[PDB]
């Protein structure tokens with residue numbers, strides 16, 4: 002079934018990726034070894050020689066924890082080096098209302114690409130290496146021979162095939178918005194969940210009887226309490242915990258704190274003066290001392306509780322800019338998070354939590370609040386953010402994979418100074 | 427030596443062409459000196475006479491061994507290298523002895539004339555061109571071309587090792603009893619077959635190799651242990667660092683202290699408790715290479731203890747997958763931590779150290795986790811699995827720290843090991859102020875130019891102190907103030923600070939910094955029974 006390949010040319014003055022493979026657990030080497038061995042047979046990937054200096058990293062994640070793992074190729078570098086000229090020469094338009102649907106489900110169609118053969122030239126740029134424990138051996142080296150998962154040129158080149166396989170469905174059902182971000186299809190409906198769920202498996206099987214396998218066969222009529230439909234509900238996306246406390250009594254400290262939070266609101270809402278509250282502190286009084294109010298003090302409070310309950314403007318989304326996603330440990334499995342592009346011009350703040358306790362650690366959480374915040378980004382603006390993760394690089398670099406489930410990888414960095422920006426939120 | 431060997435197609439960087447660097451004339455003795463090395467070379471087919479207009483040339487230079495038992499041919503491929511494509515970086519990571527699995531026999535193999543045994547991409551042959559002169563225009567210069575891997579080219583080690591791997595692979599599979607490790611020209615073979623077989627199997631290997639043009643004058647498995655490799659003394663069932671020498675000198679210069687720290691860090695792999703803070707604290711070298719620098723007092727003591735340690739040979743054992751992989755850490759003190767990883771009680775697998783890389787503030791618990799962190803990454807690279815940590819900290823202290831810590835962490839499985847010093851929080855600040863406690867509106871700034879300031883305070887109870895400081899900064903005074911406040915306050919206190927700087931320094935609850943002020947403040951925090959620092963905006967903030 003040889004198809005005509007589609008020429009891939011990186012931006013000129015750009016050479017292929019040469020990123021180094023992170024060291025892995027023997028367990029994971031073992032899995033990748035098996036997986037690649039199999040792909041080698043299917044002819045998906047092929048062994049390469051030393052005349053190929055290129056290398057993008059590969060990890061091993063647990064699909065849906067079943068007996069097997071999935072191989073996860075971090076094509077972040079090869080993407081910047083291409084897909085950015087393939088966000089162009091092959092842009093996949095983003096439906097500005099998928100975030101409006103009552104329900105969005107995400108299905109893994111990535112496995113489609115695997116048929117389409119990869120441009121004979123561009124292959125070399127995909128080489129990846131299965132590492133050896135304690136370097137006792139030369140990494141195992143492979144390069145792709147078909148469109149690969151994780152590399153944004155795959156949904157771009159398959160786009161043709163996709164919009165066709167889906168056409169005679171996007172018909173019967175003309176109100177469902179379907180968006181393809183990388184290896185995932187984001188189906189959005191306004192149906193009562195029950196129907197949506199069906200409509201999706203309606204689609205699930207449509208694709209299926211036309212070739213496209215989608216593992217989103219989460220489970221069977223037996224309820225062992227596994228987590229339900231990657232059903233996002235972007236019509237409930239919102240937030241206003243810019244919550245000042247409404248207390249019975251107010252102390253010197255209380256205000257002090259208050260007058261504080263209200264001061265950083267200063268670059269978020271240049272609208273709240275505190276001289277009226279803060280003046281009730283020009284004195285060097287006790288701290289535990291409770292002291293009721295002052296003049297427009299209460300007005301400055303009841304009035305701020307308002308402009309603060311009414312979001313700011315000028316805050317528009319620039320597609321030229323990148324999405325920056327700051328997160329923060331809040332304690333007791335709670336994590337608050339902002340998505341912005343310019344300081345204090347939040348495009349969307351938010352929060353996350355799991356069920357706090359004797360089963361979840363911080364990393365798994367973080368690793369989650371990230372895949373959560375990411376997805377949200379994809380749905381809303383069709384593009385992942387760059388996470389400013391409050392965590393030590395190496396620690397994160399060792400475990401992120403453990404609880405990772407997305408077939409993609411945002412861009413991230415590590416902060417080591419989170420101020421009481423934790424307070425304000 | 428091989429048509430059966432498959433050549434790796436080579437290429438010149440995108441828009442470049444082949445080297446053209448004319449040959450300088452050399453002494454007549456050398457011309458034939460090369461002509462001998464070359465005809466017996468072309469004879470061996472390693473190289474080949476080439477006809478006019480292979481516009482590409484590279485410099486040849488007969489070199490004397492300085493022992494003059496014979497002469498040696500040497501080419502300068504710098505320019506070819508600068509023009510050949512990149513290859514897959516080999517040896518970018520090297521195995522650590524502590525990760526090699528316990529084996530019986532291990533026999534190295536000096537695979538000799540190796541680079542000249544592997545063929546060379548036909549097309550990339552024309553750039554290897556080099557000309558040997560004919561005695562000053564006497565002739566068209568004896569001109570050769572390479573058909574094997576030029577002994578100093580760019581993709582030689584790679585293409586070699588690649589090619590080798592392919593050659594072993596067959597045999598390697600016909601024997602899961604033998605494991606092989608390639609190292610440049612080396613070939614270390616190991617096994618668990620009765621030494622009688624293992625010696626019979628190496629015979630085989632060797633013959634296998636031999637049929638592939640790859641020779642090994644190394645018959646009987648010549649070279650014996652302890653094997654010298656990347657600076658390791660590797661014995662049959664033990665390993666260590668190739669002996670080191672910490673010279674004793676009168677005056678120490680930068681290039682001197684550097685090789686010293688280098689030697690010391692390096693010996694740390696297996697020599698317990700080696701410290702290096704002080705010796706390096708010196709190297710904040712505004713990198714003046716021969717800037718003579720006087721060992722400080724501690725540096726002199728530090729280096730001392732290292733000697734006491736180094737003198738006495740210490741070894742490391744190998745890996746037995748079948749046993750656990752344990753790791754233990756113990757705090758030295760000035761931000762220094764040391765660890766050893768083991769399976770058994772007395773002989774270690776490997777050791778090492780960790781210190782908070784200069785940053786004026788940090789806590790013991792934080793430091794201990796960063797240590798645990800480094801060990802985890804080391805374990806994953808060496809053994810492919812995290813180890814069981816045995817740490818000088820109590821679940822209660824640890825878990826209370828990660829819960830209050832703003833940054834996320836991951837504490838693998840660990841056990842408590844009561845053996846001081848002990849990692850513990852010497853004081854916790856009050857979350858809510860303290861009822862009745864004299865609030866200290868602490869404050870203190872300075873004049874950036876004049877380098878003069880004052881730290882003082884005013885309390886509810888109308889107590890006001892103001893002290894003058896000469897030669898300090900707004901930062902210095904902001905803590906100077908807080909400190910002050912602690913001094914005068916009773917055993918419970920409320921302090922209102924205008925500086926986040928001061929806030930954070932203390933809020934992280936650092937347990938140390940050679941920064942005598944913070945020490946004083948820290949020592950004072952430990953003494954009190956209830957302290958509450960609370961932050962309030964500066965300028966506008968208060969009056």
Ligand SMILES: N#Cc1ccc(Nc2nc(N)nc(Cc3c(Cl)ccc4[nH]ccc34)n2)cc1
Pocket residue numbers: 137521522525526527529532534605606607614615616653655660745
């Ligand atoms: N797990 C495991 C494992 C690791 C290595 C081998 N093979 C092996 N074991 C020993 N003791 N020495 C040698 C030879 C060898 C030397 Cl001279 C020096 C550094 C080395 N690094 C690498 C191999 C090696 N090979 C076999 C199994």
